Amino acid sequence: LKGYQLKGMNWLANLYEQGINGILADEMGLGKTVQSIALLAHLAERENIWGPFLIISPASTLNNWHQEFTRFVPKFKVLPYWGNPHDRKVIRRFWSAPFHVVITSYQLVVQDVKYFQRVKWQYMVLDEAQALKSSSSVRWKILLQFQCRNRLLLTGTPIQNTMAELWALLHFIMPTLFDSHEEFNEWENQLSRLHMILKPFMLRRIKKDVENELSDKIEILMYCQLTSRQKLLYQALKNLVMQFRKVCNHPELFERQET
Amino acid sequence: VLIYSQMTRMIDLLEEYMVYRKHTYMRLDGSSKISERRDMVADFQNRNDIFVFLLSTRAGGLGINLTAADTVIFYDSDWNPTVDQQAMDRAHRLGQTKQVTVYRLICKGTIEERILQRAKEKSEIQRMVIS
């Protein structure tokens, strides 16, 4: 593994021993999946290994995650759950025990929640949980309804949204310690208290700690002037928002040229 | 180069142009199936014929490990920040040892200016809140 990697794995193992559940927020490219695989490997008492590992990742990340399991360790067995109703139903019937890890999308878990309910789950990790910020969504409630002792996350680039996001994140981390949204809102001073509260059950690396040789990307802006037709349309408009940005980006959408 | 866009209509116009000029055209949008995604992503490592790759932010940037590319071009702006960030990093990860450069085609302060200002303010916030 790596230094930071091993340290995060040890922190996760210590939190598991203490029974705490937390996030694993690191920059993209630092090896989140590798750290999760190492943490899964660390389990040797035959407690989590005996049961399954529900990995609820986004749809796009099904194949890379899958490959990562088929290459990182020749021991873990994957039982993908994403595809035609037939194949998925057959896979569900199969375990209905070598079901080590399971790969499923967010929508597939919510739709087929009943299938997952009848199966007990030793460990659950929901990668890329940056989507799980709105508590009013059905996804949040469905994820909350699962009966799992330990919850782990590998979501990156956290927060940055409104306080709603923060309420959702924290209340998911633990049902206790958090009661109402406005309450959380009530709890320089504010920022320091929030940092102190989130310090124990969270990590962070950034790019300087882990990037030992990574050229600092160069970001370049480029203003572009609107053309004649674009201006005639912008004038018409001036004299909504979606239509507006469209007319800007390109006019063909509202006025494909004729013959 | 990796081009990122949002509107499928836009993507289609861009496709039309990339067929007018011969630069090759390989896309993987949200309408593409997961198997076709996985396929194109296997191709774009260990294959070099694809000059340019056409993605959308939510569909492709998050979790696709596109280290092969050296440059990223954002044709359009996003209201919520940390979304072009996913793409940026997806190209600037660990296997991108060649170079990293992220352009940003914006307009001359027409209506994009408000979006860029909001994005900069939100990025500054998210920067200082927890770091």
Binding site: H66, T70, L79, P80, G83, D87, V90, I91, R93, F94 | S35, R38
Partner: peptide
């Protein structure tokens, strides 16, 4: 008498396992 149904049971089980393996190797690309 019940041995024939038991053996049919495990041959159905191995057929199902073969089908699952076929689905998995189709899924592995």
């Amino acid at each position: 008498l019940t041995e024939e149904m038991l053996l049919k049971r495990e041959e159905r089980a191995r057929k199902r396992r073969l089908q699952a393996a076929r689905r998995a190797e189709e899924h592995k690309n």
